[PDB]
Amino acid sequence: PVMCLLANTTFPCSQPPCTPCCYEKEPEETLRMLEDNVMRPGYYQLLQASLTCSPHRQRESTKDNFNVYKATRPYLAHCPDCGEGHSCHSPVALERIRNEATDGTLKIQVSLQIGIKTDDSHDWTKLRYMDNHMPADAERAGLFVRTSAPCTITGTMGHFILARCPKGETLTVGFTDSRKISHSCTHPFHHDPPVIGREKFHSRPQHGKELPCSTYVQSTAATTEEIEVHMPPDTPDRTLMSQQSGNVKITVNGQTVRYKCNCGGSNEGLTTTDKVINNCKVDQCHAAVTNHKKWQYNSPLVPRNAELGDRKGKIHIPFPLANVTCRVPKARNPTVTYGKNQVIMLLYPDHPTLLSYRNMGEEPNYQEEWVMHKKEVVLTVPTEGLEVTWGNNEPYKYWPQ
Amino acid sequence: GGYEHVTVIPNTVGVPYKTLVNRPGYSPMVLEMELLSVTLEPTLSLDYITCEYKTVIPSPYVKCCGTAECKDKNLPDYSCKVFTGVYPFMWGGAYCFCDAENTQLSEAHVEKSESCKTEFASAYRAHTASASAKLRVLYQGNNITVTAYANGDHAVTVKDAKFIVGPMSSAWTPFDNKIVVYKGDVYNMDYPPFGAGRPGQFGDIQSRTPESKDVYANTQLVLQRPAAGTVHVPYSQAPSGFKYWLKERGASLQHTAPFGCQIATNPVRAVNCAVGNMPISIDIPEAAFTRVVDAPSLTDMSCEVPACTHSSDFGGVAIIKYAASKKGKCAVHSMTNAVTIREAEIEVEGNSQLQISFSTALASAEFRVQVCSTQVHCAAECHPPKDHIVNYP
Numbered sequence A: 001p002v003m004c005l006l007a008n009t010t011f012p013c014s015q016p017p018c019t020p021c022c023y024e025k026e027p028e029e030t031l032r033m034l035e036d037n038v039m040r041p042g043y044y045q046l047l048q049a050s051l052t053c054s055p056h057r058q059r060e061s062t063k064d065n066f067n068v069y070k071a072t073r074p075y076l077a078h079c080p081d082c083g084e085g086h087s088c089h090s091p092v093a094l095e096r097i098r099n100e101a102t103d104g105t106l107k108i109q110v111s112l113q114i115g116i117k118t119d120d121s122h123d124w125t126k127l128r129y130m131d132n133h134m135p136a137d138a139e140r141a142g143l144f145v146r147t148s149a150p151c152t153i154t155g156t157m158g159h160f161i162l163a164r165c166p167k168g169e170t171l172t173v174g175f176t177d178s179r180k181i182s183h184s185c186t187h188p189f190h191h192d193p194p195v196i197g198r199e200k201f202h203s204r205p206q207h208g209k210e211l212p213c214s215t216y217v218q219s220t221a222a223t224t225e226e227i228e229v230h231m232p233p234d235t236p237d238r239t240l241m242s243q244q245s246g247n248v249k250i251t252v253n254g255q256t257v258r259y260k261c262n263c264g265g266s267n268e269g270l271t272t273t274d275k276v277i278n279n280c281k282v283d284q285c286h287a288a289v290t291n292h293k294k295w296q297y298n299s300p301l302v303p304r305n306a307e308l309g310d311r312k313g314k315i316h317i318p319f320p321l322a323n324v325t326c327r328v329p330k331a332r333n334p335t336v337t338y339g340k341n342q343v344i345m346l347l348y349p350d351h352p353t354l355l356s357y358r359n360m361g362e363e364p365n366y367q368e369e370w371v372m373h374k375k376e377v378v379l380t381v382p383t384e385g386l387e388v389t390w391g392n393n394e395p396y397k398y399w400p401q
Numbered sequence B: 001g002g003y004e005h006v007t008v009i010p011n012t013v014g015v016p017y018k019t020l021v022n023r024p025g026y027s028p029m030v031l032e033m034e035l036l037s038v039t040l041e042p043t044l045s046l047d048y049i050t051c052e053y054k055t056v057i058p059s060p061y062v063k064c065c066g067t068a069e070c071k072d073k074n075l076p077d078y079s080c081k082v083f084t085g086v087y088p089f090m091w092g093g094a095y096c097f098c099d100a101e102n103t104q105l106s107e108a109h110v111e112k113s114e115s116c117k118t119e120f121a122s123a124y125r126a127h128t129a130s131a132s133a134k135l136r137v138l139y140q141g142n143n144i145t146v147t148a149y150a151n152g153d154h155a156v157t158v159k160d161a162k163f164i165v166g167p168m169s170s171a172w173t174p175f176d177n178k179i180v181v182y183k184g185d186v187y188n189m190d191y192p193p194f195g196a197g198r199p200g201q202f203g204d205i206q207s208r209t210p211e212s213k214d215v216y217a218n219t220q221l222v223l224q225r226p227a228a229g230t231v232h233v234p235y236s237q238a239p240s241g242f243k244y245w246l247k248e249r250g251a252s253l254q255h256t257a258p259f260g261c262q263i264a265t266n267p268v269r270a271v272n273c274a275v276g277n278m279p280i281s282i283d284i285p286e287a288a289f290t291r292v293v294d295a296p297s298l299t300d301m302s303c304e305v306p307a308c309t310h311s312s313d314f315g316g317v318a319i320i321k322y323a324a325s326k327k328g329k330c331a332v333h334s335m336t337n338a339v340t341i342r343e344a345e346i347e348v349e350g351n352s353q354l355q356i357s358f359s360t361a362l363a364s365a366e367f368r369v370q371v372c373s374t375q376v377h378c379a380a381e382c383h384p385p386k387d388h389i390v391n392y393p
């Protein structure tokens, strides 16, 4: 039995008392409960049950409809280059670029959410981004990734993009909104992935030498890797305040607004209803909409919520890094001629091919060179023997007669 | 009550060696021995593992109209700084009500990256390797495989024949006291001890075990003042030491090791290091032998060499005529060390002839062939081969 905590009580993680539709009923309370169990071993059992909605007023069961995106949201964050070198509050802000995959695949994290609509429904042809105060829908086709030239996007899900990029010094992620306006974010990133094996090739072969390599799996499933999430900070909005003749009028519009004025009387407060600040000017006041019903990635580009302390949750992420196999081509066997304690090879590489050799005695004297084009190599074969490795081929061994 | 045959072969894999077993009063026996593999497996003691680090940076604490306070947190490379006079902006305007007296608390720490389970290098303390050998023996017309420790103590019995392999003439190993393992590659490296790793170098992050919760970190992490009206956590840090080592490691032991060593992992071992010789002890059982009287007697022997080429392989052909007393199996062996015969045993019957394959380096090869208990002289004029270089030992 795995146990979770709620205020002064303990309960089974998979069975919170709020069920069914914990989040739909009380969004703030559900997220607060999840944050209180972040360190508990049964946190993911609680996350699954709390973010699943199978209501009573329904014929069928939707007990497998766990959707983490009902609690999370796309956001606006700092980007140093939104185009032409100018910084902006970007709806496609770059968070982190991961390049641990030896196959060259890049795992990119952005402020928007791909494959999710504003109503939380999953749709691969759609994308959701933060448009001013409210999230909006955009096309997946308009999404692009580029370094020095365009990238091949291999997978997209939520805040994550998988891409195969050519050599570059910057990384750009962009999209086209509903109003046909292009939005992009550029970060300095040195991309020049190392060679898998001993041959620098362009296209992936169907057959070849099986070599160990790592990749970010194209599986949409989120089971191993994770990110930290928390409630967003107060969202500043000047449009909430208006000048009522010669005073300040704060219109909430069915929202929870935190206000503060540089005037006397009831100048501050967390209001759910409309408030008026008499003998005050609109410039002397600060107004912001609170977000206690939603979760957001623990972004260093967004400020922390001042009200709550170190309160945080965690969510599983798609495309984890995994050990796989990479197929590499084997360079064609060279034309070999012999001489007294000497081997002559006529190398004809189709791409950069690594040539290495060593003596099979006490003094190996290891030597290596990357063969770019047609080159004749003269090698001395000692009495002990000579071992020659030409690209991804198995080592050739030579001995004198 | 068998017979112990003791011989010494060079520690070279893929070379068949012929040994003549001569038990007094018993017909000679020819045994073919070939080393299939020689494994040197060192005892490993894991010091730590290293991988790419992760700089954990949460949302900065922007205290509007107040002063934030940094506290000492027991986390690897924990960095905390409170910046005064900040006025950050969000899309809809200023985040703080106050013009002055706003502070930003920037905090960061280092931990293992999500990649550490998949992409990692292990630091091992390698000591006193146990030598093992796989030997193919052509015994009684059949190939038998003997796997034994080459210490001269481990007795392995196959078909009643007791085998004692070693001790190795050379105690040489391609592995140093300290080694580093990355996937299928092994490196001789005097790696920094745990808690001594340098920034941007191998060991900038150190984890005793891959499951370890607490890690050592020395990445030179320094937090910087954020840009005017900008919410972000700028910092300076030395790049991943593991990522740097991956490109700076050079060629692994499989490519650099002397004596043609092959290097394998899971477990870490040196395979087919052609160094020194290997003594072999075979306690051949009583039943395997045939008495001289019970074996055919050969007379009127003559040898003719119609074709010979002096090379590393069996380039010589010899036709030996004989007069056998009875039908039976006879052992074939060269009495001259400069010539070696491919055949170990042939069937004889009366006034007939046998064909053997021989290898020699001599242009004028004069050698004696012992078929059963009778010797025959072979005169051979061997010619040079087409190639000065060959692809077999």
Ligand SMILES: *[C@@H]1O[C@H](CO)[C@@H](O[C@@H]2O[C@H](CO)[C@@H](O)[C@H](O)[C@H]2NC(C)=O)[C@H](O)[C@H]1NC(C)=O
Pocket (backbone or CB within 6 Å): A008, A009
């Ligand atoms: C947790 O605290 C609650 C509320 O203070 C306790 O429940 C109340 O207890 C009083 C006094 O016994 C009752 O009169 C109320 O009717 C209770 N309310 C509810 C909603 O249960 C509760 O006992 C505490 N939980 C534990 C496990 O000790």
Ligand SMILES: *[C@@H]1O[C@H](CO)[C@@H](O[C@H]2O[C@H](CO)[C@@H](O)[C@H](O)[C@H]2NC(C)=O)[C@H](O)[C@H]1NC(C)=O
Pocket (backbone or CB within 6 Å): B016, B138, B141, B142, B143
């Ligand atoms: C015992 O083992 C040896 C070595 O594998 C066998 O020898 C030969 O086997 C094949 C015969 O055509 C060839 O493909 C090999 O090149 C050859 N090797 C050598 C070193 O001569 C031999 O046949 C085996 N004998 C039995 C009885 O199984």
Ligand SMILES: *[C@@H]1O[C@H](CO)[C@@H](O)[C@H](O)[C@H]1NC(C)=O
Pocket (backbone or CB within 6 Å): A323, A324, A325
């Ligand atoms: C990944 O590595 C593990 C050993 O840690 C092994 O069990 C597994 O089969 C590997 N998977 C692939 C696809 O190579």
